[PDB]
Ligand binder design. Sequence first.
Ligand SMILES: CCOc1cc(C(=O)O)cc(-c2c(C)noc2C)c1
Ligand SMILES: CCOc1cc(C(=O)O)cc(-c2c(C)noc2C)c1
Length: 117
Amino acid sequence: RKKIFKPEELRQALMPTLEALYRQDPESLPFRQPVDPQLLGIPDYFDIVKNPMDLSTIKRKLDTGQYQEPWQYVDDVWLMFNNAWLYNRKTSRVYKFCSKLAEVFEQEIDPVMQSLG
Ligand SMILES: CCOc1cc(C(=O)O)cc(-c2c(C)noc2C)c1
Ligand SMILES: CCOc1cc(C(=O)O)cc(-c2c(C)noc2C)c1
C-alpha cells in the first residue's frame, strides 16, 4: 500500500524543479557536468567525495526512469549539494553558488512534493 510512481509521471512532476536549477546563470554552470578533478588540478576530489553527482546525471536518471519514487530524486539533488558544500570553502564562489541552487530548490520542491502525496 505504498504509493506507486510511473516514470513518465515522475518526470512530468519533477522536471520543472530540475529546470529551475539549470536555468540559474551563472550559479548552475559548475554543476551542469561532473566535476573533472584532472581538469581542475585537484586530485584529492574523489578521495573526499566518494559519490559524485551533478545536474546532467540527475537529468539522465529522470529521462531514463531510474527513480522509483520522488525522494530518490531529492537524495541525488542533495548528494550534489552536499558534495559541493563538503569539498569547497564556505567563502568560495562555488559554495555560494551551491547555496543559491539549494535556496531555489527549496522553493520549487515543496509544492511539487505535496502534489505527489
Ligand atoms: C519545464 C521543462 O524543463 C525541461 C524540459 C526538458 C525536456 O526534455 O522537455 C528538458 C530540460 C532540460 C534540463 C533540466 N536540462 O537541459 C534540458 C534541455 C528542461
Ligand atoms: C566547469 C566548471 O566546473 C567547476 C569549476 C570549479 C572551479 O573551481 O572553477 C569547481 C567545481 C566544483 C564543484 C561544482 N564542486 O567541487 C568543485 C571543485 C566545478
